[PDB]
């Protein structure tokens, strides 16, 4: 009920209105987002509370209610879609051919798409609609342009 599959905004509020700090994915009863979005704070979902279950600052990932479930991988060849959920805007799909981050721990697909801070955690999809990673941990090249890793956890 409070964990139905889908993409969700992560919001904060106090005694006034709400601000979107990120996005995440509900799959198999587990909520998935980036560590920098929530810092491991508990999340309200309707009348219920979701508590962090697993997370890792270096990977910049966190899961709630259970272990990380998303395991689809970019195939290194195909176009992908960012299902961007920008603050104040409807969810939208943006198709792109990833580049790569070449790292000492392997190649990571990387999308040269620039969306605001609160879009962090938006899912990146393969052609079957599976989530191959989350958007929003990236680099900035010399001219200022942004490139995000396709950040995926381990199931």
């Amino acid at each position: 009920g409070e964990t139905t599959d889908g993409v969700y905004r992560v919001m904060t509020r106090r005694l006034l209105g709400s601000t979107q700090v990120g996005v995440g994915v509900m799959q198999e009863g587990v909520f998935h987002t980036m560590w920098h979005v929530t810092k491991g704070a508990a999340l309200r979902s309707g009348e219920g509370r979701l508590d962090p279950y697993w997370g890792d600052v270096k990977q910049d990932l966190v899961s709630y209610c259970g272990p990380w479930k998303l395991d689809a991988a970019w195939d290194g060849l195909s176009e992908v879609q960012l299902l961007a959920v920008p603050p104040g805007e409807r969810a939208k799909n943006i198709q792109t051919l990833p580049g790569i981050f070449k790292t000492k721990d392997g190649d990571i697909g990387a999308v040269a798409l620039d969306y605001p801070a609160g879009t962090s955690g938006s899912p990146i999809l393969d052609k079957c609609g599976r989530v191959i990673g989350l958007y929003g941990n990236g680099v900035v090249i010399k001219n200022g342009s942004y490139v995000s890793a396709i950040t995926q956890g381990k199931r």
């Binding site: 599959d5 889908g6 993409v7 969700y8 905004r9 992560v10 904060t12 509020r13 106090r14 700090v21 996005v23 909520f31 560590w35 920098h36 929530t38 704070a41 508990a42 999340l43 309200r44 979902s45 979701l50 600052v57 270096k58 990977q59 910049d60 176009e79 879609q81 299902l83 959920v85 409807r90 969810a91 799909n93 943006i94 198709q95 792109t96 051919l97 990833p98 580049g99 790569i100 981050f101 070449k102 790292t103 000492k104 721990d105 990571i108 990387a110 999308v111 040269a112 798409l113 899912p123 999809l125 393969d126 052609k127 609609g129 989530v131 941990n137 680099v139 090249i141 490139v147 890793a149």
Partner: protein
Amino acid sequence: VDMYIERAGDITWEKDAEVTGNSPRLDVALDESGDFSLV
């Protein structure tokens, strides 16, 4: 702070998707803080 979630959509690939962005090959390092940088 009330941090909460609200539905934004169903997770699907959209065949009518705008295609954009380049495809860079970048040498990158990841530090223990979770920050990527260019090598």
